[PDB]
Amino acid sequence: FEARRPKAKAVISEIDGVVRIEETEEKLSVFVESEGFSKEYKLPKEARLLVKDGDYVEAGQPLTRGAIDPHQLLEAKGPEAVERYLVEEIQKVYRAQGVKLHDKH
Amino acid sequence: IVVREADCGTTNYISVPLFQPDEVTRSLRLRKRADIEAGLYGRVLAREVEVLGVRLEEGRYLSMDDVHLLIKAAEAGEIQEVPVRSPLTCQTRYGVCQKCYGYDL
Numbered sequence: 001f002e003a004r005r006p007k008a009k010a011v012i013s014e015i016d017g018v019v020r021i022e023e024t025e026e027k028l029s030v031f032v033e034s035e036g037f038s039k040e041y042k043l044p045k046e047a048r049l050l051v052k053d054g055d056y057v058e059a060g061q062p063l064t065r066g067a068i069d070p071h072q073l074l075e076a077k078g079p080e081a082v083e084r085y086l087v088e089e090i091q092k093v094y095r096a097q098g099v100k101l102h103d104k105h
Numbered sequence: 106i107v108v109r110e111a112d113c114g115t116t117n118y119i120s121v122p123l124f125q126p127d128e129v130t131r132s133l134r135l136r137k138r139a140d141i142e143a144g145l146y147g148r149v150l151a152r153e154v155e156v157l158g159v160r161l162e163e164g165r166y167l168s169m170d171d172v173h174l175l176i177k178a179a180e181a182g183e184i185q186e187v188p189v190r191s192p193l194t195c196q197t198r199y200g201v202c203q204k205c206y207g208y209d210l
């Protein structure tokens with residue numbers, strides 16, 4: 001509700017394309033290759049990937065498990081995507097406690 | 106925020122999903138009934154829907170029988186999302202309109 005940036009935030013793709021893993025002992029890096037662009041994401045060693053090689057990711061789609069930064073998602077996808085994310089994530093907490101609450105509120 | 110008029114005349118809407126992208130199985134699975142009811146019950150249809158030989162007209166409030174009929178159609182693979190009016194797309198200043206809010210729970 002305060003739109004704060006999570007400490008252990010996930011990493012999302014700013015552009016859409018095909019992923020390219022380069023796992024090595026030195027570091028782990030994730031490459032998003034497109035028709036004319038190629039972006040590099042340097043994940044830490046303790047990164048729980050949810051995307052494998054040969055997958056088609058879109059802008060705003062997460063590449064690692066964790067909580068998405070609302071401000072980063074707003075710039076990548078748009079106002080409609082961040083509103084959908086906020087309503088769904090808030091309802092997850094209230095469902096776990098068995099509380100029924102309409103989406104309108 | 107106060108309900109200040111009957112209709113704002115807008116044409117924007119939101120689409121309420123009926124399926125969820127399960128990650129462990131990498132597939133689309135039907136959402137729970139309580140989650141579907143929490144986002145559809147007592148809401149005004151933005152567009153006309155035709156499922157299971159029944160015509161639901163635009164501008165119709167969704168009763169709990171209508172929500173259950175929609176879930177039945179989803180199980181038969183006839184509909185994936187429902188277009189409804191929401192406060193997120195209302196154009197009333199300083200509040201919402203009657204059609205964008207829905208029913209008094």
Ligand SMILES: [Zn+2]
Nearest residue numbers: 113195202205
């Ligand atoms: Zn309205």
